[PDB]
Design an enzyme around this catalytic site. Structure first.
Site, PDB file in Angstrom:
ATOM      1  N   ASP A 128      -3.059  -8.944  -5.985  1.00  0.00           N
ATOM      2  CA  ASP A 128      -1.850  -9.734  -5.692  1.00  0.00           C
ATOM      3  C   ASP A 128      -1.725  -9.977  -4.203  1.00  0.00           C
ATOM      4  O   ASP A 128      -0.701  -9.689  -3.590  1.00  0.00           O
ATOM      5  CB  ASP A 128      -0.592  -9.058  -6.245  1.00  0.00           C
ATOM      6  CG  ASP A 128       0.584 -10.021  -6.419  1.00  0.00           C
ATOM      7  OD1 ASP A 128       0.575 -11.155  -5.891  1.00  0.00           O
ATOM      8  OD2 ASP A 128       1.563  -9.623  -7.085  1.00  0.00           O
ATOM      9  N   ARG A 132       3.758 -12.313   1.076  1.00  0.00           N
ATOM     10  CA  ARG A 132       4.837 -11.400   0.705  1.00  0.00           C
ATOM     11  C   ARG A 132       4.324  -9.977   0.570  1.00  0.00           C
ATOM     12  O   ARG A 132       5.117  -9.036   0.637  1.00  0.00           O
ATOM     13  CB  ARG A 132       5.496 -11.809  -0.617  1.00  0.00           C
ATOM     14  CG  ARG A 132       4.531 -11.834  -1.800  1.00  0.00           C
ATOM     15  CD  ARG A 132       5.188 -12.196  -3.141  1.00  0.00           C
ATOM     16  NE  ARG A 132       4.111 -12.281  -4.128  1.00  0.00           N
ATOM     17  CZ  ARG A 132       3.324 -13.346  -4.288  1.00  0.00           C
ATOM     18  NH1 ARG A 132       3.536 -14.449  -3.581  1.00  0.00           N
ATOM     19  NH2 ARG A 132       2.313 -13.305  -5.140  1.00  0.00           N
ATOM     20  N   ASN A 133       3.018  -9.815   0.363  1.00  0.00           N
ATOM     21  CA  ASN A 133       2.421  -8.486   0.204  1.00  0.00           C
ATOM     22  C   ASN A 133       1.582  -8.077   1.404  1.00  0.00           C
ATOM     23  O   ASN A 133       0.634  -7.290   1.274  1.00  0.00           O
ATOM     24  CB  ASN A 133       1.629  -8.389  -1.098  1.00  0.00           C
ATOM     25  CG  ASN A 133       2.524  -8.493  -2.307  1.00  0.00           C
ATOM     26  OD1 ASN A 133       3.641  -7.970  -2.292  1.00  0.00           O
ATOM     27  ND2 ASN A 133       2.071  -9.199  -3.354  1.00  0.00           N
ATOM     28  N   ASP A 146       0.189  -2.715  -0.843  1.00  0.00           N
ATOM     29  CA  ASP A 146       0.344  -2.641  -2.298  1.00  0.00           C
ATOM     30  C   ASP A 146      -0.882  -3.116  -3.072  1.00  0.00           C
ATOM     31  O   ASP A 146      -0.795  -3.543  -4.221  1.00  0.00           O
ATOM     32  CB  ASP A 146       1.661  -3.302  -2.731  1.00  0.00           C
ATOM     33  CG  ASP A 146       2.875  -2.568  -2.171  1.00  0.00           C
ATOM     34  OD1 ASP A 146       2.857  -1.321  -2.165  1.00  0.00           O
ATOM     35  OD2 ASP A 146       3.810  -3.220  -1.679  1.00  0.00           O
TER      36      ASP A 146
HETATM   37  C1  LIG Z   1       5.792   0.007   3.721  1.00  0.00           C
HETATM   38  N1  LIG Z   1       6.971  -0.863   3.625  1.00  0.00           N
HETATM   39  C2  LIG Z   1       7.402  -1.315   2.420  1.00  0.00           C
HETATM   40  C3  LIG Z   1       8.478  -2.160   2.278  1.00  0.00           C
HETATM   41  C4  LIG Z   1       8.928  -2.595   0.921  1.00  0.00           C
HETATM   42  C5  LIG Z   1      10.292  -2.504   0.611  1.00  0.00           C
HETATM   43  C6  LIG Z   1      10.767  -2.869  -0.639  1.00  0.00           C
HETATM   44  N2  LIG Z   1       9.945  -3.309  -1.571  1.00  0.00           N
HETATM   45  C7  LIG Z   1       8.656  -3.393  -1.333  1.00  0.00           C
HETATM   46  N3  LIG Z   1       7.776  -3.851  -2.316  1.00  0.00           N
HETATM   47  N4  LIG Z   1       7.630  -5.232  -2.385  1.00  0.00           N
HETATM   48  C8  LIG Z   1       6.821  -5.780  -3.224  1.00  0.00           C
HETATM   49  C9  LIG Z   1       5.997  -4.956  -4.090  1.00  0.00           C
HETATM   50  C10 LIG Z   1       5.040  -5.550  -4.922  1.00  0.00           C
HETATM   51  C11 LIG Z   1       4.231  -4.783  -5.730  1.00  0.00           C
HETATM   52  C12 LIG Z   1       3.222  -5.480  -6.613  1.00  0.00           C
HETATM   53  C13 LIG Z   1       2.522  -4.468  -7.515  1.00  0.00           C
HETATM   54  C14 LIG Z   1       2.187  -6.171  -5.715  1.00  0.00           C
HETATM   55  C15 LIG Z   1       3.897  -6.542  -7.489  1.00  0.00           C
HETATM   56  C16 LIG Z   1       4.365  -3.400  -5.724  1.00  0.00           C
HETATM   57  C17 LIG Z   1       5.301  -2.801  -4.893  1.00  0.00           C
HETATM   58  F1  LIG Z   1       5.390  -1.456  -4.889  1.00  0.00           F
HETATM   59  C18 LIG Z   1       6.157  -3.558  -4.085  1.00  0.00           C
HETATM   60  C19 LIG Z   1       7.130  -2.996  -3.140  1.00  0.00           C
HETATM   61  O1  LIG Z   1       7.305  -1.774  -3.054  1.00  0.00           O
HETATM   62  C20 LIG Z   1       8.089  -3.052  -0.106  1.00  0.00           C
HETATM   63  C21 LIG Z   1       6.611  -3.262   0.121  1.00  0.00           C
HETATM   64  O2  LIG Z   1       5.794  -2.175  -0.280  1.00  0.00           O
HETATM   65  C22 LIG Z   1       9.157  -2.542   3.459  1.00  0.00           C
HETATM   66  C23 LIG Z   1       8.717  -2.064   4.681  1.00  0.00           C
HETATM   67  N5  LIG Z   1       9.285  -2.375   5.934  1.00  0.00           N
HETATM   68  C24 LIG Z   1      10.526  -2.931   6.180  1.00  0.00           C
HETATM   69  C25 LIG Z   1      10.936  -3.026   7.507  1.00  0.00           C
HETATM   70  C26 LIG Z   1      12.169  -3.585   7.763  1.00  0.00           C
HETATM   71  N6  LIG Z   1      12.924  -3.993   6.747  1.00  0.00           N
HETATM   72  C27 LIG Z   1      12.507  -3.884   5.505  1.00  0.00           C
HETATM   73  N7  LIG Z   1      11.326  -3.370   5.217  1.00  0.00           N
HETATM   74  C28 LIG Z   1       7.599  -1.205   4.753  1.00  0.00           C
HETATM   75  O3  LIG Z   1       7.213  -0.782   5.841  1.00  0.00           O
END
Ligand SMILES: Cn1cc(-c2ccnc(-n3ncc4cc(C(C)(C)C)cc(F)c4c3=O)c2CO)cc(Nc2ccncn2)c1=O
Length: 265
Positions: A128, A132-133, A146
């Site tokens: 994926d 966005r990823n 991811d």
């Molecule tokens: C490591 N990380 C993760 C995120 C973050 C936050 C919320 N959702 C996600 N997401 N987003 C998308 C996502 C997608 C998947 C697929 C399996 C590919 C469909 C699997 C996930 F597990 C996630 C996930 O966990 C992430 C992405 O893993 C945000 C970060 N940073 C910041 C900084 C400032 N403000 C907000 N976020 C960061 O450093």
């Protein structure tokens, strides 16, 4: 698999929700910035993930958002990863769209291409790949996030090729038709990602539905050259979109192409 002691984690900030639920920013042992995914019950094939998780943790490269470890001796389980202060690449592109030089855009493509060359060398599929990823750190380095997790998603709107969450706009014909994933399907997605970078975060095939996108790319429609992409850069992204998977480059070749453009400029 590194089983992290949850007592060593201090939660600090909400980072929003993703496919597996809530993600938080915190520290490990009071020092190291980490992200912590709290895996929502029912969102993930957990036994499958735990059985297969070590392979993912052994992936180590500067341009990957590292999966450090897991907390599995409790409910919900946690996944602990590298923290990226500037958040996802898609939002970063859109929020700073008036500040980028084209050399910075190419550097973003190089960052991602290095990560993907490494995954390719480990015979490991992202599945994926998209802006966005990818995430961006405090120094503007882009890293791929991811990777491999799409396999464990329990959400029929995401796993069905005709579901409203399936990444149709990043998928080659053989994925849409046969669910045939390979490093060559990651190659196709990478080309779309390059297009996202050079268009400063526009939606690919905007105004087309998913099924219209599928129909038209199967018939040969391709993303146009973004204004900020030189012909050389466009040739690189376009090469990712050969109808036939075996005519697409490897990430090793793409990286060489990208470096060549950098040297000339
Ligand atoms: C490591 N990380 C993760 C995120 C973050 C936050 C919320 N959702 C996600 N997401 N987003 C998308 C996502 C997608 C998947 C697929 C399996 C590919 C469909 C699997 C996930 F597990 C996630 C996930 O966990 C992430 C992405 O893993 C945000 C970060 N940073 C910041 C900084 C400032 N403000 C907000 N976020 C960061 O450093």
């Amino acid at each position: 698999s590194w089983e992290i002691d949850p007592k060593d984690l201090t939660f600090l900030k909400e980072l929003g929700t993703g496919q597996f639920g809530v993600v938080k920013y915190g520290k490990w042992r009071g020092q190291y910035d980490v992200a912590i995914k709290m895996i929502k019950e029912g969102s993930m094939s957990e036994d499958e993930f735990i059985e297969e998780a070590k392979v993912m943790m052994n992936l180590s490269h500067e341009k990957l958002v590292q999966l450090y470890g897991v907390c599995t001796k409790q409910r919900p389980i946690f996944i602990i990863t590298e923290y990226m202060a500037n958040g996802c690449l898609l939002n970063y592109l859109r929020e700073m769209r008036h500040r980028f030089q084209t050399q910075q855009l190419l550097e973003m493509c190089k960052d991602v291409c290095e990560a993907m060359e490494y995954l390719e060398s480990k015979q490991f599929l992202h599945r994926d790949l998209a802006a966005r990823n990818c995430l961006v750190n405090d120094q503007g380095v882009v890293k791929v996030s991811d990777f491999g997790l799409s396999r464990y998603v329990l959400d029929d709107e995401y796993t069905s090729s005709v579901g409203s969450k399936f990444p149709v706009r990043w998928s080659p014909p053989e994925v849409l038709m046969y669910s045939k994933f390979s490093s060559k399907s990651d190659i196709w997605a990478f080309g779309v990602l390059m297009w996202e970078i050079y268009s400063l975060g526009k939606m690919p095939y905007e105004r087309f539905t998913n099924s219209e996108t599928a129909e038209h790319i199967a018939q040969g429609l391709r993303l146009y050259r973004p204004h900020l992409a030189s012909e050389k850069v466009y040739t690189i992204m376009y090469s990712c979109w050969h109808e036939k998977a075996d005519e697409r480059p490897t990430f090793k070749i793409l990286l060489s192409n990208i470096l060549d453009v950098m040297d000339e400029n």
